[PDB]
Amino acid sequence: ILGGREAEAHARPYMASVQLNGAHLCGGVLVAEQWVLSAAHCLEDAADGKVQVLLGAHSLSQPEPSKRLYDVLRAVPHPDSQPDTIDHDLLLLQLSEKATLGPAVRPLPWQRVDRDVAPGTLCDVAGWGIVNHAGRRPDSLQHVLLPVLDRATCNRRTHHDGAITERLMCAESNRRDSCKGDSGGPLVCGGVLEGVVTSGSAVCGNRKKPGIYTRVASYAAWIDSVLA
């Protein structure tokens, strides 16, 4: 997270660290007691390759009562996701067992009605992604507040050139943006999960390139069917 701030420890009890071989790979959001939502590309490339999810965490390395590592029973990427596209870039992970809920671990309500988030709404995105252009990554969770950018403006050639579908959304990324390792992370509006960070970035904070987030409401049907 670029242009952010260390978050209050465990103030976002839904926050997940999706992990590969003991290292933070991606953000994630606990959406049901045994299900975490993330990005499909976090996993694409394959793995062979131990995937796990850290819940109740603030610091990735330091001891905390609420920290708990879960093995993953099944990785369900969205079947229409492709390793070379930003489209349908969602991944569901069933935990080895239902999560132990508490002040530091709680599922987050997500959006099921397929309407756009009003442009100008301030939404909260958190993660352990790189914090500067030199590529340094935080030990503890960062967050930032970003205004939602209208899709029309986000589709201008200078920005993303018509690529932002009705299934995607944009947030302003002028000095403040989500970066590499923030993928799969949650974009949260008024206490409700609206976005999942897609593939970005490392080219983090270019205002001419807004942050792209997959709209969860667009994949409500899919999420439910996997969860049943």
Side-chain angles (χ1 to χ4, degrees):
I1 298 285
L2 185 89
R5 167 211 228 29
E6 186 184 329
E8 184 187 289
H10 323 285
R12 286 157 186 88
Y14 52 88
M15 198 58 204
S17 174
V18 181
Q19 303 211 341
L20 181 78
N21 302 318
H24 171 87
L25 180 88
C26 278
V29 60
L30 184 80
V31 293
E33 298 190 22
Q34 211 180 343
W35 289 96
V36 164
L37 182 64
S38 209
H41 70 252
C42 288
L43 216 94
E44 59 93 312
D45 84 62
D48 178 55
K50 198 171 181 179
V51 185
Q52 282 168 314
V53 8
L54 184 65
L55 295 178
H58 185 244
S59 154
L60 293 174
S61 61
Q62 320 250 66
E64 297 165 7
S66 74
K67 279 169 87 176
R68 222 278 222 197
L69 254 201
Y70 295 90
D71 296 292
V72 169
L73 258 27
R74 22 149 29 193
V76 185
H78 188 295
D80 289 306
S81 69
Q82 281 170 257
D84 57 19
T85 56
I86 55 161
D87 296 318
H88 325 120
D89 178 33
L90 296 174
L91 166 82
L92 278 164
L93 306 160
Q94 201 188 359
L95 303 185
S96 60
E97 55 202 61
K98 294 164 189 206
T100 304
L101 304 190
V105 183
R106 183 66 68 177
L108 186 75
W110 55 281
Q111 192 63 248
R112 290 179 223 235
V113 305
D114 193 4
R115 110 274 182 239
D116 284 344
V117 180
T121 305
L122 290 170
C123 303
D124 189 74
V125 41
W128 290 272
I130 60 162
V131 299
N132 66 11
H133 292 102
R136 98 84 157 146
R137 349 168 208 183
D139 164 66
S140 58
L141 176 77
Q142 308 294 293
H143 85 104
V144 73
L145 276 165
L146 304 168
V148 176
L149 211 216
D150 60 289
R151 191 183 284 99
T153 308
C154 199
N155 272 326
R156 184 134 199 101
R157 34 219 280 96
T158 45
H159 299 162
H160 288 295
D161 206 4
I164 314 303
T165 70
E166 89 284 340
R167 305 261 232 166
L168 293 165
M169 64 178 289
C170 298
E172 282 198 57
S173 79
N174 183 34
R175 317 158 284 240
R176 332 203 215 290
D177 194 0
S178 58
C179 334
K180 199 217 212 306
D182 285 314
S183 288
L187 176 76
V188 181
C189 314
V192 184
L193 172 77
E194 295 285 3
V196 181
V197 183
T198 85
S199 65
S201 37
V203 44
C204 176
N206 179 27
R207 47 147 166 68
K208 130 175 263 284
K209 244 71 171 197
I212 309 162
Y213 306 76
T214 308
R215 289 205 315 117
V216 306
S218 248
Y219 304 86
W222 177 75
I223 302 174
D224 284 347
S225 46
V226 175
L227 267 58

